Point group: C4
């Protein structure tokens, strides 16, 4: 029945105390008791409680005692509204689900997001080791492998051993060591042997900002990969079956076509849904053609639906990383 | 000729009553009659009508008695403005068509959007039945089908019958039962027979949130599929005709090329507009090459025009579903 | 040196008259002369000029006499700010070029954007005529064309003549008639003859809202087509030359490869830049492979750069058309 | 302990001087000393300091002495807030990294972004020279090159020499001259010889606005090219190795498949990651098929992650160029 005047920095808001006592735990509710005159800045000639805060968002906080819900403005960023919430006693978890995903979310994007002359003296050997690995397989140095290649990689491993004689000698305590510095253990005496020779680049690929952002993205968006894989698996199964039966109705067995099984149809339905189209297997009857024309479009759609959700994350994280790089 | 002072929560707005009587059905219009002093909170010393509401949107409501049109702000969400509209007596259908699609919509996105150990004991059998179906066709277990596969699927159907001896016994009343629990009716005694064996996954594909959002999208956007199909059909017809005639002018019949008919040109014009390109049929004359270079681009455009409209829906619905999942 | 108080609807703005006389043609400038007391609503006890307008944008208008430039807010739509501009005497062409493309935009998107039982009795004949045209070419009804097909199309043309005996008889005056109702002139006595038989669908393709929006888009964005064609032509020329010379350095003539000319390289460079890839012509030397790996990416980029500009137009126009369809 | 009233144009903001002395270098801090009454517009009856500026952003400036951080509003553009910052003494480099990339951003998009009858008399010769170059290679005018083609290009070079007899004669001082007007030096007496004949179009391709915007984009976004190249190189290396070993486990050498080396796998892994798919090399074992189905998706993702960042730049720059073209 009575009115009180919350003067939030020059621009006074009036309300009924019956409105302020809707949520009795927060700070504003304390104003309503007949004791607040002994706690806050009560000017005893205009009866207004001074509160020296941003007056352009407090009219959205107070629009949580008036109606009953709490929304976020669109004229302030996340952290500004969050600081104001934290002040006034409101909880940052009553935000309605419409104004929540565009308010969390810079808070979910923070995400913790002269020996510099031998770093190149290690990168050079990393790259030459990658090259020697990629050339050991070529059937030009295998008339039986030529000796100069194993000599080169011997120099590489005798330098990597030298570098591994400091990361255990001068380190204080006791990921990129056990299953990533394995080729050093290997050369001294092939799939799992030398796949790891190429993994050493993931050691230095943390000093580049773009790959740090990519790594943070590939783990802050780990649901939109299950989603994409499940979409693609459903599509592959459905369209493999459809194309098998379609090609079958088009005239003692299936010897006039490529899709002889439902399994082998998975290869086709995945080189078609992705709009790849090698050309090893394609439809050859009008029913097969209709099913393929359906498959291409369904694939475009079920791939383009979650990939934008994946991509906005990288956009935001990379924008933040560059903004942090371009500021002192 | 007279002025009145609508004090909407501390920040008074003045107007002429001649402005407030533009729409005589709403609440504000009642203020103008020489009786409102007996209805509302009329402070009889400053002559201001108190109205204890958000003062940052009421200056957009009142900007519907001043000009004549009603627009929505961009510093508040949908539901906030909608609640304020509902209060003041304004109708939410006078919104101009520019400020309408970005005001409807969180209202069109709500869209209604220990026996948990046998659910896995049903999913296991669903998956093994899918696998046995996909392996019955392979020409490795058909020297004539091997007996262990029909034995396996017999175990599967004798478990699904057991599970179907409760969904009719203990159910109160009397979609996923008639045309989805058909293989149980089948095995006891092939296209329409066993296509349905794979449909059982659509029973469990409602417990995943991503597929619920996909299902809601595929039906809240059922116009943008007719649109895409019509675009693609027009493109296919036009470019099939163009490529037939083009390949024809390039020198007694058409025995030097692939496009011998206007029908068979549909397959090409749809594996090209989608940027698929198998390679079974391609142009082989300079006029055919120009028409194909036109077809690829027209296809990219007439596919990328409505697909973003389809994709924004999934983006919004999935954002809402995740926000609702991440909040108590 | 003196201050005056523009009371724009309850929320008074103070300024110096020396500020208001920056642009002497507009309305506000009239307030500054020592005569405005005889023109406007001058309350001669608080010395404030009443102006009964939106007080949330006038603080952006007045921020054109203070600094010297004119910007648009982001908390109001286009037409709202435009109406306020039109009132205050400001011109809508002084808007700075940053706040202009997001202010023009609904103004550039307006863009002018029981005989209903014989419309189907014409669409049926249109479709059957399209089908008879597409089947006249097939080498199944050409053992020499079978008589039933020309009989069918004779029925079609004898109905279209009947319908053309009203659009000249009962029309008041004197596009879709001369070069679109040509087959009627044709059958009574082949490229340009019967391409037009398929054009009749563009007569009815104006009653669908999606194709109306597509037609408005394809002409409100006629610069972003010259742009795309020029990008693609530059790319095609550059990469055709590059791939010719590359494939040439890889070891008396060029008889070991596909790219024997710079012209024929255009076909490849356009089925590759569009990520189509038929497979009729591909690189076969390491230099050719590097150039092709460059071509694919340059094509993706120079196609994806203007296509989003093309697509936003359709997005906006279609949103507007649907908003206008969903409102009385 | 004391309060002061910054009247920023009609809408007074109150604060404690203890708040205004948080940053003692800026202008507002001067208000707090017991001398400001002799410097600013101090009305000595309401004790308010007049400051005649936009009152809708100063409540965000002052929200930098209250909390400690500085954010940008979303209801004003970049340059407006920047002008207000510049006024008040605040530095435009304390902006928090969330509100920075959407505040820089028009400032990072400005970026410096009757002889007109012989310009066509040069473009004609440029185009005919391009055509003669592209036709010198064709094996239709090489029965040995026909004389009319070298005659034509002789006319072209004797006109380009004439035009090069003015750009050195009447030019005041002493890029598009040394390595771009080289064919004139060439014809008077082939890879590096005549690649440059096509470079002359880059001389005139600065008079088109679309290509000016493209050129500004291709250099304001030179990090997102290193990023894309590094993503693609990592992908190519990883998936080349994976597909080699996969195809190897699928059953004395590798004579049953295409991927015989890790190098040649780069061609495949780059015509697949880009969703090109020629069809010259594809997987032929189930493990190869799984790895290829992984490669297509990883390629789609690692290409679509930085390309939107590249594309937004062209969008913004082109919008600005068109807005500047459409305004006096
Ligand atoms: C000391 C130092 C300074 C700068 C950088 S660095 O950040 O500038 N930098 C250089 C190369 C890479 C890289 O990760 N290359 C991967 C690759 N491409 C093809 C095969 O492997 C990153 C690293 C170390
Ligand atoms: C009781 C329970 C708990 C969780 C889930 S669940 O939601 O986590 N869940 C699991 C599998 C699927 C699925 O739909 N798989 C489809 C498919 N992929 C390849 C062929 O078929 C969904 C379901 C039930
Ligand atoms: C009287 C009336 C009512 C509705 C419509 S209508 O708007 O609903 N409508 C129907 C078909 C089309 C169309 O344009 N079809 C093109 C096509 N597809 C394949 C070949 O040609 C549009 C038209 C007329
Ligand atoms: C005097 C004047 C006026 C207008 C223009 S102009 O700006 O309108 N203009 C015209 C052609 C181009 C162009 O760059 N063409 C490239 C190309 N396409 C295929 C091969 O090469 C640009 C230029 C000069
Ligand atoms: K493709
Ligand atoms: K392809
Ligand atoms: K392709
Ligand atoms: K292909």
């Amino acid at each position: 029945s009575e009115r009180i005047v919350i003067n939030v920095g020059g621009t006074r808001h009036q309300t009924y105390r019956s409105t302020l006592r809707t949520l009795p735990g927060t700070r504003l509710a304390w104003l309503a008791e007949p004791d607040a005159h002994s706690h806050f800045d009560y000017d005893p000639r205009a009866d207004e409680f001074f509160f020296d805060r941003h007056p352009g968002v407090f009219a959205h906080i107070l629009n949580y005692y008036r109606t009953g819900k709490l929304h976020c403005p669109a004229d302030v960023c996340g952290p500004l509204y969050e600081e104001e919430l934290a002040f006034w006693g409101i909880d940052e978890t009553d935000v309605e689900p419409c104004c929540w995903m565009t308010y969390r979310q810079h808070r979910d994007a923070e995400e913790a997001l002269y020996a510099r002359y031998v770093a190149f003296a290690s990168l050079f050997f990393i790259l030459v080791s990658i090259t020697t690995f990629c050339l050991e397989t070529h059937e030009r140095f295998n008339p039986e492998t030529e000796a100069f290649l194993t000599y080169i990689e011997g120099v590489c491993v005798v330098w990597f051993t030298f570098e591994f004689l400091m990361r255990v000698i001068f380190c204080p305590n006791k990921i990129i060591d056990f299953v990533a510095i394995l080729p050093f253990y290997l050369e001294v005496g092939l799939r799992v042997v030398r796949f790891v020779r190429i993994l050493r680049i993931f050691k230095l690929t943390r000093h580049f900002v773009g790959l740090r952002v990519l790594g943070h993205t590939l783990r802050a968006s780990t649901n939109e990969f299950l989603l994409l894989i499940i979409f693609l698996a459903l599509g592959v199964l459905i369209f493999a079956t459809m194309i098998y039966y379609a090609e079958r109705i088009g005239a003692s067995a299936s010897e006039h076509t490529h899709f002889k099984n439902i399994p082998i149809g998975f290869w086709w339905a995945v080189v078609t849904m992705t709009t790849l189209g090698y050309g090893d297997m394609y439809p050859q009857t009008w029913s097969g053609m209709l099913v393929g024309a359906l498959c291409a479009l369904a694939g475009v759609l079920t791939i383009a639906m979650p990939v934008p959700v994946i991509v906005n994350n990288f956009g935001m994280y990379y924008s933040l990383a560059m903004a942090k790089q371009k500021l002192p």
